[PDB]
Amino acid sequence: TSPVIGTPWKKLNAPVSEEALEGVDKYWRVANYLSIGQIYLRSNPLMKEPFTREDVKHRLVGHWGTTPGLNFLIGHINRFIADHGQNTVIIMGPGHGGPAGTSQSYLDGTYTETFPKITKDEAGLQKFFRQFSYPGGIPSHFAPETPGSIHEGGELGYALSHAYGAIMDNPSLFVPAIVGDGEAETGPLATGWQSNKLVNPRTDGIVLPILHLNGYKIANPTILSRISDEELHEFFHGMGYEPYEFVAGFDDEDHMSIHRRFAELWETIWDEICDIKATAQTDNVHRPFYPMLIFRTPKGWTCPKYIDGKKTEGSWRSHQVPLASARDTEAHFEVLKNWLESYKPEELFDANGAVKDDVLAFMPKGELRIGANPNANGGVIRNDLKLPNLEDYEVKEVAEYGHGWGQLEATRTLGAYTRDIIKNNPRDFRIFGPDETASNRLQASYEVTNKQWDAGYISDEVDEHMHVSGQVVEQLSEHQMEGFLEAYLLTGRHGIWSSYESFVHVIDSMLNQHAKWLEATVREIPWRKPIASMNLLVSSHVWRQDHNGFSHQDPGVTSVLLNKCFHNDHVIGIYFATDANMLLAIAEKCYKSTNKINAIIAGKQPAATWLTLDEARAELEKGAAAWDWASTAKNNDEAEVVLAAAGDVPTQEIMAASDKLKELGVKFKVVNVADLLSLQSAKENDEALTDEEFADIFTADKPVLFAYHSYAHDVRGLIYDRPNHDNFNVHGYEEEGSTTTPYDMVRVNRIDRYELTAEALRMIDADKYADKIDELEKFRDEAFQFAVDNGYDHPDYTDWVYSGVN
Amino acid sequence: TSPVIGTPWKKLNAPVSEEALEGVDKYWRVANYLSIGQIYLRSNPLMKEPFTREDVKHRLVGHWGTTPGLNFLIGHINRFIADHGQNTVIIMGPGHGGPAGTSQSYLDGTYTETFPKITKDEAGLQKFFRQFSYPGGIPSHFAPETPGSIHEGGELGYALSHAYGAIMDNPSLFVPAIVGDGEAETGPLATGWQSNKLVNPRTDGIVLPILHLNGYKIANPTILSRISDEELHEFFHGMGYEPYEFVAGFDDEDHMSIHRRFAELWETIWDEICDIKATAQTDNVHRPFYPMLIFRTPKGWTCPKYIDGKKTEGSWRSHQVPLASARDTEAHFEVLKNWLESYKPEELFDANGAVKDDVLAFMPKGELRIGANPNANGGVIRNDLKLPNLEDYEVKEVAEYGHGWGQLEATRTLGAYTRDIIKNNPRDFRIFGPDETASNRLQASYEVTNKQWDAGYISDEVDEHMHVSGQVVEQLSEHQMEGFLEAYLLTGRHGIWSSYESFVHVIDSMLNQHAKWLEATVREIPWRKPIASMNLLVSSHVWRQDHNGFSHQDPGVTSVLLNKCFHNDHVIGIYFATDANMLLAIAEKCYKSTNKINAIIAGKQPAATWLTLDEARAELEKGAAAWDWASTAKNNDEAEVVLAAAGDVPTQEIMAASDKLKELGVKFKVVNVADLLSLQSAKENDEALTDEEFADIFTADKPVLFAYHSYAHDVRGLIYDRPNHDNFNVHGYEEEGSTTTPYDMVRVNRIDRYELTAEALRMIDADKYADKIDELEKFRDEAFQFAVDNGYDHPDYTDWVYSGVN
Numbered sequence A, B: 001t002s003p004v005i006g007t008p009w010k011k012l013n014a015p016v017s018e019e020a021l022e023g024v025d026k027y028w029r030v031a032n033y034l035s036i037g038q039i040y041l042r043s044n045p046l047m048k049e050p051f052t053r054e055d056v057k058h059r060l061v062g063h064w065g066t067t068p069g070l071n072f073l074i075g076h077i078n079r080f081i082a083d084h085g086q087n088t089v090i091i092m093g094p095g096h097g098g099p100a101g102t103s104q105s106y107l108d109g110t111y112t113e114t115f116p117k118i119t120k121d122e123a124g125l126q127k128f129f130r131q132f133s134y135p136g137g138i139p140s141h142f143a144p145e146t147p148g149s150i151h152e153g154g155e156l157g158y159a160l161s162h163a164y165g166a167i168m169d170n171p172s173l174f175v176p177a178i179v180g181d182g183e184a185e186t187g188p189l190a191t192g193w194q195s196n197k198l199v200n201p202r203t204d205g206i207v208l209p210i211l212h213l214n215g216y217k218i219a220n221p222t223i224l225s226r227i228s229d230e231e232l233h234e235f236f237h238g239m240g241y242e243p244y245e246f247v248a249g250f251d252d253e254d255h256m257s258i259h260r261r262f263a264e265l266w267e268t269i270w271d272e273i274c275d276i277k278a279t280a281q282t283d284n285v286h287r288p289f290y291p292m293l294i295f296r297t298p299k300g301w302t303c304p305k306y307i308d309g310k311k312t313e314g315s316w317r318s319h320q321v322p323l324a325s326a327r328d329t330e331a332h333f334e335v336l337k338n339w340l341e342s343y344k345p346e347e348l349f350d351a352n353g354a355v356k357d358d359v360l361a362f363m364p365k366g367e368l369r370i371g372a373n374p375n376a377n378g379g380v381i382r383n384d385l386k387l388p389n390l391e392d393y394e395v396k397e398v399a400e401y402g403h404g405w406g407q408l409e410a411t412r413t414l415g416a417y418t419r420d421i422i423k424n425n426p427r428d429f430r431i432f433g434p435d436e437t438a439s440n441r442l443q444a445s446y447e448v449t450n451k452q453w454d455a456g457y458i459s460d461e462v463d464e465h466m467h468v469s470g471q472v473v474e475q476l477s478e479h480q481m482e483g484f485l486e487a488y489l490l491t492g493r494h495g496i497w498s499s500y501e502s503f504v505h506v507i508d509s510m511l512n513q514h515a516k517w518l519e520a521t522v523r524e525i526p527w528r529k530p531i532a533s534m535n536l537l538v539s540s541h542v543w544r545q546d547h548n549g550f551s552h553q554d555p556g557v558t559s560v561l562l563n564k565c566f567h568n569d570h571v572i573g574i575y576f577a578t579d580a581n582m583l584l585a586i587a588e589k590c591y592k593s594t595n596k597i598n599a600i601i602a603g604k605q606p607a608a609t610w611l612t613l614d615e616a617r618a619e620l621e622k623g624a625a626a627w628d629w630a631s632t633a634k635n636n637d638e639a640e641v642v643l644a645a646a647g648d649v650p651t652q653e654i655m656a657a658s659d660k661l662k663e664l665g666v667k668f669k670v671v672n673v674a675d676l677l678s679l680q681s682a683k684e685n686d687e688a689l690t691d692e693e694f695a696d697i698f699t700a701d702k703p704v705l706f707a708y709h710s711y712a713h714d715v716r717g718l719i720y721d722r723p724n725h726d727n728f729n730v731h732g733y734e735e736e737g738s739t740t741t742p743y744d745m746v747r748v749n750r751i752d753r754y755e756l757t758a759e760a761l762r763m764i765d766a767d768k769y770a771d772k773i774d775e776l777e778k779f780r781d782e783a784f785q786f787a788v789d790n791g792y793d794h795p796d797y798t799d800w801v802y803s804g805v806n
């Protein structure tokens, strides 16, 4: 679970010391200098004679506009941390404020600790400035390469979901969450403000949202800075916050008055938070209004007010670089030089180029430093789950009655397994869902926990399984669920969320950003320890969406996740749960895995159970497997056709087609694919099937009929250099469907058992089986006409049991 | 432009008549009856003796919980429309309230008009009930098949973006926008409330948001119904709304008092809207507070209060069906029978099964009916754009100087073209962008229009190109931009939005839902006229994202859009703008197209111009084309290799590789692919290249080196059955990159000119060219080491001009 770090929720009981404020003002100057040096300078960091245009980088990359505001806030937060011993993680929402994050880590000493070549002297400072956003250096954003980041904030709008995920079951953790005022215009951010209705001030930590109201986004004003101050305050009060406003930099107040004013307001806010935390030790049934800070400052604060007659400080014109080419004109170089000198670096750095002791003597030390807090490197906190014994949940009836027995709902099995994970791993495992946990059949967890709800309660007739604390969280937002879980994992804990398949697409871009985090971490950031995997139960899938119908039918999550499978990163798992015993095997592998995004595509409809758990674990280790109990070919040369399937509904239709083929005497081989990346090119993926293993399973030369759960294009693209790939005939979802019966869903997508039987006969000999082929095609129209007439599927479809069942 | 319909913004100046309210109450009863009949009944709609369990559908599909609330609102809105002659489109946010939408269209007469077999008598009523969510019938949601829908509301959260898009440049249009209170938890909905800062009450219409606060989503309470009433009101007032609350159904108030109370509140709200509209004829500089309605009613209102001892009315238990199987138990059938009888259908329907005249005598008539308003079938409003003459914008310097001339930014050309579209098509064309219009270089439109901004103005030093009305709208939300545009198109107008490539993924699920709308429309809904295409400029793409770096590098929009290309729908266009003249040809085709989603992938970096406009139009008609001016093979049998490219940066690297190959004497053929679906299987796509056309371009048997803009998996999947496809060697984005130089981006993804030159020689003869191959690989490391040392790319890279340039 989360470590208790420091002395949390302590009031100061004194004014902020004038010395600490002189610390904060020097911090802001030197962090601003170091932010500018990283953007503009390739050499001569301390502007020794001669400082000329040759010291300027040839291409200016990075963002000034948000940066001096972030440096201000970070300076004051560091003072706060050292004075109070508070366990603190910062969410840098305007993540293009990269130079502030790297400057912080350089000043707190964690940068040189982590990156020993970047020393705390003039040659290390030169390397520090050159490397920023440079070929072979470090990124422009607050990337996972930076000590202290858990959030790159490249794609905007997840700051608050990540902040609130971080504090769940983390009652000593304080998260100051800096939100762009442009970022507050996004969808995901806008709903993220309501997360305070889903956290509990006793059992969870505290988020302080900080609205970086600098007035501007890239080229536009921001909505929230142009509405009235009364509207802006009512808005935050309507969302359960008590808003505090700070305004600075729009007049000629000296910088030391600003710091005193801010430290006074910070400590007032903090006294309000400590009151909330102290009250919650007794009463955590009544939701407080949490503080939030509206930080109103000019964009690009302390850049030159006018460059070439255009307003730059307090404008969108300061967003990227205020000064656009200091290398090309003497005039513009002089502006850069005077700007760099306005921070007076002669007082900040000593003769050797180290930042002076009195600049940083207010800073926190040890694990309380922003770049050294374990919650910001949450792999160091994370332990293996205590997992229950997987055979306790095994469907034993396959071994009793035969492969293909029963009408179980496979996700109920996962639900019972996850219930006992939650029971064995209190405060360490969570379930998230967008109001779909019961619907996706995971509600056995309510026997051991509750849905965390901190809005109003009204009646025990409606409010079953809800409590102000609990390990299940539901809000109708895929962005919230994915974002909560992502930060729960990045801070060292574990979990799962579930979703209807077609709505996974809502968070495709969040999955992309989590995968780029993971890809960069496993390629090049070894000091960042492995975090628990992002586990996604994909249920209510396309084949059993014949009640919501056509516009809820999109299995396309698989195509998205296949674009993050390169260079042996192995950060993606794509798993088709064939039945409940395969779902168990998959779930245990995903629950033991680290540094991944695991998609688990499982049906929740009643379906057969095909495998025992020991067979499921064997198929899962390779990824695909022949089912010799289902083949009537007895090796690869007497097979006429290979019937392969990936997914529970393709497996059902292929197994029903193999029974009709067997009745015709045909010699075939049956294959199941549980793990989709096992089919990936053996050159590209060293966990995938070797080409010899692939040709034993599939064959060297026989026609393979392949029923696939998602778009056939996924498979055709993956097997492009596999042996015998020209003989594959992939059937997937093909954008057909309506609100209809289950048979009609498989029929219109050409994956029903009769079409698959017919396709196998056309592949073997379309001419000797011509009579029986015309017979199967006529039945397809007749079983559809039965559904129209009677209101339910034809009994040859619905009553079918595999002949292996005794 | 939008038609002025009716007598807009007229006050009533009288109380609502008691007769009209008696109409509304009968409407609600019969719409509730017809909603239940559609869910439960397969036969005997008017429960003639004998009404037994055989009349009940075998499988119950659909949603009761939202429905009686929607029927209430729709009844009162119909009364409003007939009394005021207001041009009105409803957005049904809880779109799973399908039976309300179909019941409305059946009652207003537009259903039988559109669907002549569904007559207004007892046999038509039987067909009406059976067809709902049934095999071979109609969908469960408010689908495009329903007269009156412009929004299916399957995937939740776009109700307000669509409402506000609908009213843009539509000053007579009133849009009552019904928002689920669960739907209000989503990201896209939460930011959609701020859209009132982007509309102008003179030049645009009026949205009335209606929060369907029924207290419950699927299985949970809703956040907004469990916070305090003071918080809920402050929230809406903070977002620029004046909230009104209506509460009904939680006591024993008779239904006629409820209707009177509601009609009084409706007319008060409407008098406030008419005041806003009347004020805006004089002062449209000051943003009003728009009304909004909080409609607080029990979920499942008028269902039986308790079923089997569980609270059903006013619970999440009424969400899908209150009564779960009326076909299986005598007890549950009797509950259904008494429920159906509580509406007293004997007073609603006459002897023949027609709804009685006095039920519907309050209804609107003609084009003012919800299902007959042209804004709900916006293809009937839409005209061809007046498009300017495309040769006025042609880069003529290709013909002067040679193929490969210049350093133009291709999107500036599109920007000038779109400027003059806007100028020629006032109030008919809009640009949307998520604060990226200038950045994607489309800012020539500010010469003829402004960015529409209706929040506060502060200074001419920051507020350039902004006005309270204008044809460009910017908010930092891809959900808003995509959703605004989608409704502007569905109401008959035209436009374009632009985005950075990697953030297109933010709205993948909105693109999916628009594509399913389009797919269903072109397959089976001929009365729904073609709308203008959804045009998306995809710029700042993966190759020139070496300043934001790795986590902004995702070209994966192409893989998403390839999953919507089936069954000859042709609702997707995927276009790679090779240069500015190809961008013109693409843009004109997309601006003339109907019923599509067009992705236009164009670079905004300085690049060469390869084609004249007349050549670009020739390549675009087929989709791919050989470049005989660039080949040194003079037919297909003397080519040793085929150098193909799709995208401007792959084209640049392939053209630079062909110059180095030419210097070696190699005989090659150069191919450009502008239209990605031209490569799709000729069986699957009858607009794609025939197999004979494909083998003339690519060859029957030569090695094809293919540099592709996005993931190589897209292409490998598409060409799986094309001639010579085993000889393709696709190079795409392979998830490598950092913040770096442009050369280093192409180098790490194995698509740079030196690697491509080397791959061509390995494909031709890896053994005779072994010396020169080892030479090219060593230069790749040396040009990377140059960038590290100097800060900019090697001059052999940066200074290259194609030898065709004179």
Ligand SMILES: Cc1ncc(C[n+]2csc(CCOP(=O)(O)OP(=O)(O)O)c2C)c(N)n1
Residues within 6 Å of the ligand: A065, A066, A094, A096, A154, A155, A156, A157, A179, A180, A181, A182, A183, A184, A186, A212, A214, A216, A217, A218, A222, A299, A319, B434, B435, B476, B503, B506
């Ligand atoms: C989802 C998304 N769309 C677009 C962008 C491009 N972008 C980067 S910074 C930025 C402006 C950010 O504004 P704010 O949130 O206002 O940041 P700050 O001013 O503090 O720099 C935008 C639009 C983005 N990062 N994310």
Ligand SMILES: Cc1ncc(C[n+]2csc(CCOP(=O)(O)OP(=O)(O)O)c2C)c(N)n1
Residues within 6 Å of the ligand: A434, A435, A476, A503, A506, B065, B066, B094, B096, B154, B155, B156, B157, B179, B180, B181, B182, B183, B184, B186, B212, B214, B216, B217, B218, B222, B299, B319
């Ligand atoms: C983006 C998305 N996620 C999940 C769902 C599944 N879903 C359908 S209805 C529904 C509840 C809707 O609630 P509300 O908005 O509260 O609708 P109403 O009560 O009026 O039925 C949910 C979660 C959805 N439709 N869209």
Ligand SMILES: [Ca+2]
Residues within 6 Å of the ligand: A180, A181, A182, A212, A213, A214, A215, A216, A217, A222
């Ligand atoms: Ca800002």
Ligand SMILES: [Ca+2]
Residues within 6 Å of the ligand: B180, B181, B182, B212, B213, B214, B215, B216, B217, B222
């Ligand atoms: Ca609701």
